[PDB]
Design a protein around this ligand. Sequence first.
Ligand SMILES: CNC(=O)NC1CCCCC1
Ligand SMILES: CNC(=O)NC1CCCCC1
Lengths: 546, 546
Amino acid sequence: TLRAAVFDLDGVLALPAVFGVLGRTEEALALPRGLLNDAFQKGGPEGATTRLMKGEITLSQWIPLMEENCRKCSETAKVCLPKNFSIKEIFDKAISARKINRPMLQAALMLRKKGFTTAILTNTWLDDRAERDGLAQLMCELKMHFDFLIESCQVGMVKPEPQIYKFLLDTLKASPSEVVFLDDIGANLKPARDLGMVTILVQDTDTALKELEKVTGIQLLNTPAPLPTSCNPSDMSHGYVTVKPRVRLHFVELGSGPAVCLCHGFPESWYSWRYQIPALAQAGYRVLAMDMKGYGESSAPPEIEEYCMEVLCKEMVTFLDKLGLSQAVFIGHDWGGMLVWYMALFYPERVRAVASLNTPFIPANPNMSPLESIKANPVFDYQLYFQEPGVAEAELEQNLSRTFKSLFRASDESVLSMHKVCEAGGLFVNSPEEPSLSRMVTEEEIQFYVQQFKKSGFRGPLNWYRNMERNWKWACKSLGRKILIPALMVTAEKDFVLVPQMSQHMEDWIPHLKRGHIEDCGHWTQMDKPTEVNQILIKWLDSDAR
Amino acid sequence: TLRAAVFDLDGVLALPAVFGVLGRTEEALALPRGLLNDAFQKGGPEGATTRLMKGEITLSQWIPLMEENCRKCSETAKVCLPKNFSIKEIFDKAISARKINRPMLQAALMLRKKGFTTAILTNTWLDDRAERDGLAQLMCELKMHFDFLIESCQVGMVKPEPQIYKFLLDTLKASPSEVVFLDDIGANLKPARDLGMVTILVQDTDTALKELEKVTGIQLLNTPAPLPTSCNPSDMSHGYVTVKPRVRLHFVELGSGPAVCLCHGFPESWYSWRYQIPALAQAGYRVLAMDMKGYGESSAPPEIEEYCMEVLCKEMVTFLDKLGLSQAVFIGHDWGGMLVWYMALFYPERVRAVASLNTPFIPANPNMSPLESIKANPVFDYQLYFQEPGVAEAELEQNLSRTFKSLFRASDESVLSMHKVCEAGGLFVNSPEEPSLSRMVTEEEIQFYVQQFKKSGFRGPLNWYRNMERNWKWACKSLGRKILIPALMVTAEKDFVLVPQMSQHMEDWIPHLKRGHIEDCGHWTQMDKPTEVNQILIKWLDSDAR
Ligand SMILES: CNC(=O)NC1CCCCC1
Ligand SMILES: CNC(=O)NC1CCCCC1
């Protein structure tokens, strides 16, 4: 019974196969059929290509040896190679053209999710070309999804030598009968078959995947659209910056490129961005997912005033100062969305671009108390419940699992009503003791939030709501300004608190505002509709943030 | 008696003054003298410029108001503004032309080092221009060197209003007679004088600095060349990546741009790069200064084999994988320099460029044991002393302060001889109990190393020397390769262990190798000659790493 699946890189996990470029080059240059592929494999186990694939020599050292093999082959075939024939050019083009075979990676992802040990076994080289980064990026993206990556040039062994197959089995800690091995080269498949491994000759992906699902008993073809890659907290780079003597900010960091600072809402975590972190890094950005002040590994002082927008914003500027960042794109959700509009208003030189999920920009009404404003909206009743220090902390801290299971629900699953929360005397008074698990979250993901909130509880987070008068007075200083930097407003159809219509007058303050809108999406945008959030943010980033 | 120095930005800490561009524009466009400066100050306290400087409006909102003031002024002067007259263009150019007045910053640096509280008090704006990053970078660089930055647009107050001066004094916690205030605008200097502050009207920097040194009693002019900016450990962003279950790597992170991974030697710290970290970040790079395996906040497992080059290198690849970095430029010193050549040899796709300070690349001799090789060089005797587990740990751990004070010495201060270390029975047998403090280090810097080494001691670090046979066998696999990626070798004249001549045959293995050489420099390159290390690395980075 199968418990491991092994995949080749070229022609299996990555297409088009670099081998298929040699044939295409022969046809384009009208050279004898097989001339390039014959020069490539010249001398077999003793040849330059085996030396390259075993790691004896680098790609740049191999290029002239391949050129000499091509001359020798053309001489024997009684033909002439063109005026400007370049092996470097041929391979640079072949390599950049090669992309991830997405349905093959999806099938590998599915087998791994169903308990399989997965591995990439590849005949590859030590790439020292000026353009080696392209392949490095490809390998980096692919490898993360597998338990093992075995590279011929690293192990000093090559397919079809029997030793690499015995090395594979030892790495897998599996008997051959427990392994599926997928390869586009029949000769390289032969030693796995001979050992008793289930083998699949990959020509077209669909047939290979049909053979793969038939042999594993797991649905791989026609499966529903998978979720984006998530984050394993223990596999991330964790960052810590002290912004003032008693205040330290924690963040998760992934990728290279323009800095993108992710700001969560209430009562959340850097982990609320788990589905965006790998996607935005893969899209060419340096992601900084914050644990906002009062949360997770960030400091949580008890004083209410430590959580007014003016201080939160100043500390975010200090956070950039200490990291040596002149700018970052600021992306916020909920309370983070509010902070992000205020960063754009008070510190535009530090904000490359601004984006908010659900939270609109509504300027302070100078002719009305923020208390009056909040009272005027029935859905904002829970904010008055949040005012008295200790009351909401006691209910929210009593049972952590219940708190998150009750809150983190899709629009069709709601167990909470935000109206008459004060009158009812609590957020969970008409909510079950043991709520069911929402389709948006696993039990483990709820438990990460439970463990985070065991450190400081709900005092710091609730203090974000306890600065109405302070925030209002500070916001009034910005009443003559406009937001003229790149800005994106993302509304969620079914957010019954931060309704899409609350954002209707934003172009009066943000004339060049760009928009996104997510249908059938509740308040928990990032986990509700991760695929669509990623698409909206990446499209806006590549066009407006660079 | 003076204890605080206050500096203006425009025309004081930054030159040329943006005000002086309006006059230059008038002259270039042959407009009436003062037309632009008169339109700029139009309406005085009630005018658009005061609104901008107080933060009521942003720079982009102000541009058309300045245009209307220019039209009004030209109308009164009975003149016409040119065909393509643009305030945006004028200010974009003015702002990008403005650079830090280096001798003024040096004097501020010196006063602060001598115990003064320093501050920048500026009439500035909320910059939301597409090109606002240039100024953000300038402010970011300047602010780090001062105790306070007071910006008119942030405090809703402007010079010469008396309230900003009272705000300044309150921020300083100083009586006016204790303050020196430097400004290029006599009108803005007047309220400070009236309060009893010592004032300096800044025209040329030299005269201002002459007045400043006369009044403070501190040498500011003709002073020796200062050291580069160092790092305060508590003001840095600290990063942590788990590379395998029992192994976590710590790093300090500063800047944006191409990733530059700094690798220290024995027995050092990320802190050995303190003088390079701010310089390389300022030069346009994302610096990652490691605590190498066995050191500081990085894990230090006891097993010798955990420290062979093969595992150290693989973990550095995993470090890049987890941070989401397809590449980094690798810069090493001493044992870090050795690791860095091996990264280039075994993982060229992951190494953007490679640089080593002092450590040459010498390939394994396949016809000789590494023990034989080390025995053949008398200066390498101490490495045989390092072999026996426990012996060097006991001497190096006995007195930490003595260990670092004895080791970290300039070429003209040496207290240690690396020959006959085994025969003598120790590294410090002919060394004092209380060594004098080297000119390279302060007592506090020695104490940071003492505190770091209290965590894991010398076992992990000494284990870097205990893998000769393992490293040799692994290095032999690379004997047919060449290093063909961008590479830099930096030799130190007076390093009597890693002598410049040990690097003489490197072009046989690295044909395109670039070189740097530091005269009168011992083994501790980074702290011995920080200014010259920075110049060599930055020049090579900008040309070969991008
Ligand atoms: C639970 N959501 C919530 O209270 N969000 C607030 C964000 C700031 C604006 C008011 C609502
Ligand atoms: C104290 N320096 C030291 O032992 N450095 C080593 C680096 C690796 C090559 C041999 C010397």
